Nucleic acid binder design. Structure first.
Ligand SMILES: [Zn+2]
Ligand SMILES: [Zn+2]
Ligand SMILES: [Zn+2]
Length: 502
DNA sequence: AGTACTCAGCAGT
DNA sequence: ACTGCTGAGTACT
């Protein structure tokens, strides 16, 4: 069950990983011969790659009721994700159905705003049938199945998609699994083609985790009476980070806010080698870029700014690089570009959330504090509580896997660990940014990535949090603990040891 | 093994 | 905004 949840999560992570890989390969090609712009569907190719390696879930079956591992509020960008998970099989069509006896009943529906659906209440939904749009709608296939579901009283999965404008700022939050509904009644009515249209009333089954749009709603409206401060950054951030509490009159804890890292006095100034590019640094350009070569001959970012894959170290263009700030190799240096707020949690003290959907691979924020040789946990105040041991270790198994999917080739297994000579740690107990409020979780939606701009000392990189899920709005932001690299978390979330190195 | 169907997702305008 | 186009997967002839 938990085991199921992790299979789903990792399946979606794999899928999007492949998507961004295909995308990076295309961005590496010159403007003129890029497949993007000329009818490229990364969703289809990613899909096909996963299906080839037997990575689909619930393949060859229809699920009625709850798909194991799929929870209310889960977000998708592509209709295709629903297919690989078995949530909804058709790539396009709104209605999915299956045999339930000799009759056919609806497994799942998609309300994307194609027809004039009414989703006005949290509780109840009016769903337009499907028929050519000029003939009257026929009561067959999907429409029939949704009708039969009424007598059979068999639940229906409801995914609502946000209205898709080709304005298309993003695909973040494109589909939300809203959950399980019963079909109550259906009628015929004239629909705006001048021909008759079917309509189905669905009622959400009680006792389900409540709808997310209802939570952006409860949250949204200005009054925000939970506000403790408008801007915890106190103007040091291009946008205010507000603090809210609806569980108390607790003010957030006191600290000096900082956006820049405090190095010690002894930590040598080490300027880094820079690139000479006139334009934005890409693999596409005829002229080679020193910072690209530094990243192993690949842009570790997509053009929208998403990290392509985790890496031991990511090199961004420095202050003495000659490229415009719009350079794709500038992402984490530009600072926070999401609406963040800190909030009181019943259980966990103080936490960080985002009030909009965060697409997978997105940059969140830096863990800013003052940097200390690990030797000095001598301080005594920030014990654990506002402390971040800078990650030294790495394992190439995941890259080995992504590699196997995309090329059929792996590098040999290798693992890295920082010498105990220098571990470094970031203390935010006294000074830090919003990153200091991020809590820890056994199932995180954030992971820490080391980036180097400013300097080349690889023992004191910047810690940049990225997103490893499509994160629903208001979902709490959390990252996991460092780990020993001999130990890994299995399906049930228990610590085991990695299989033989070989 | 072939065809009809589509609540996507692009791309040109 | 309004078009037009190529579609994956699945259900049926
Ligand atoms: Zn650059
Ligand atoms: Zn360059
Ligand atoms: Zn550079």
């Amino acid at each position: 069950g938990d085991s199921s949840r992790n299979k789903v999560k990792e399946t979606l992570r794999l899928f999007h990983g492949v998507c961004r890989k295909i995308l990076q390969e295309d961005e590496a090609k010159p403007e003129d011969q890029r497949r993007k712009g000329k009818g490229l569907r990364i969703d289809f190719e990613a899909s096909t790659i996963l299906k080839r390696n037997g990575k689909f879930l619930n393949s060859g079956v229809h699920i009625l009721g709850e798909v194991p591992g799929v929870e209310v509020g889960d977000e998708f960008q592509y209709r295709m994700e629903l297919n690989i998970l078995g949530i909804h099989k058709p790539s396009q069509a709104g209605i999915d159905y299956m045999k339930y006896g000799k009759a056919k009943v609806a497994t799942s529906i998609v309300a994307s705003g194609g027809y004039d659906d009414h989703l006005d209440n949290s509780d109840v939904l009016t769903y337009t049938g499907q028929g050519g749009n000029p003939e009257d709608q026929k009561l067959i296939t999907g429409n029939l199945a949704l009708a039969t579901s009424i007598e059979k009283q068999t639940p229906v999965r409801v995914i609502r998609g946000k209205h898709k404008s080709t304005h298309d700022k993003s695909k973040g939050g494109n589909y939300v699994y809203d959950g399980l509904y019963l079909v109550e009644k259906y009628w015929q009515q004239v629909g705006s083609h001048g021909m008759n249209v079917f309509k189905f009333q669905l009622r959400r089954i009680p006792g389900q985790p409540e709808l997310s749009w209802v939570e952006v709603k409860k949250s949204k409206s200005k009054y925000r009476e939970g506000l403790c401060k408008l801007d915890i950054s106190e103007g040091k951030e291009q946008s205010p980070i507000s603090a809210v509490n609806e569980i108390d009159d607790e003010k957030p804890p006191l600290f000096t806010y900082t956006v820049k890292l405090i190095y010690p006095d002894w930590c040598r100034p080490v300027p880094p080698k820079s690139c000479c590019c006139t334009t934005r640094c890409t693999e596409a350009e005829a002229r080679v870029c020193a910072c690209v070569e530094k990243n192993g001959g690949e842009i570790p970012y997509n053009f929208d700014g998403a990290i392509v894959g985790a890496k031991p170290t990511i090199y961004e263009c420095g202050p003495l690089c000659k490229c415009p700030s719009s350079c794709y190799l500038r992402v984490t240096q530009h600072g926070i570009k999401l609406p963040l707020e800190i909030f009181k949690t019943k259980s966990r003290g103080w936490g960080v959330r985002c009030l909009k959907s965060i697409p997978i691979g997105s940059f969140i924020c830096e863990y800013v504090g003052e940097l200390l040789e690990d030797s000095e946990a001598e301080r005594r105040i920030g014990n654990d509580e506002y402390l971040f041991d800078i990650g030294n270790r790495y394992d190439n198994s995941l890259a080995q896997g992504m590699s196997e999917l995309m090329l059929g080739t792996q590098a040999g297994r290798s693992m890295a660990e920082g010498d105990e000579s220098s571990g470094f740690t970031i203390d935010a107990a006294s000074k830090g940014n919003v990153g200091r409020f991020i809590n820890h979780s056994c199932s995180p939606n954030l992971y820490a990535q080391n980036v180097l701009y400013d300097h080349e000392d690889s023992r004191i990189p910047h810690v940049m949090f990225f997103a490893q899920d499509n994160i629903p709005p208001l979902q709490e932001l959390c990252y996991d603990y460092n780990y020993a690299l001999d130990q890994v978390r299995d399906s049930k979330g228990n610590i085991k040891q990695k299989l033989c190195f070989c």
